[PDB]
Amino acid sequence: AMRIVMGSWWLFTLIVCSSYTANLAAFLTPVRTFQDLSKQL
């Protein structure tokens, strides 16, 4: 009833935070590379 409430709508946002958290993780993505100026560093 009201005892069932505590972690529930807590998870209605914490997992959403976690979804945004794991979301961003890769969004900026002899032979080592392909361009000569990229070799310069």
Binding site: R3, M6, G7, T13, L14, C17, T21
Partner: peptide
């Protein structure tokens, strides 16, 4: 990569132990 990340993780334990003592005292009476 995790500074205010685990803040809410402890906040849920706060409201947990809060209502854990609260309804227990309301119902053991």
């Amino acid at each position: 990569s995790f500074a205010g990340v685990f803040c809410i993780l402890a906040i849920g334990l706060l409201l947990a132990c809060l209502v854990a003592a609260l309804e227990l005292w309301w119902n053991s009476n």
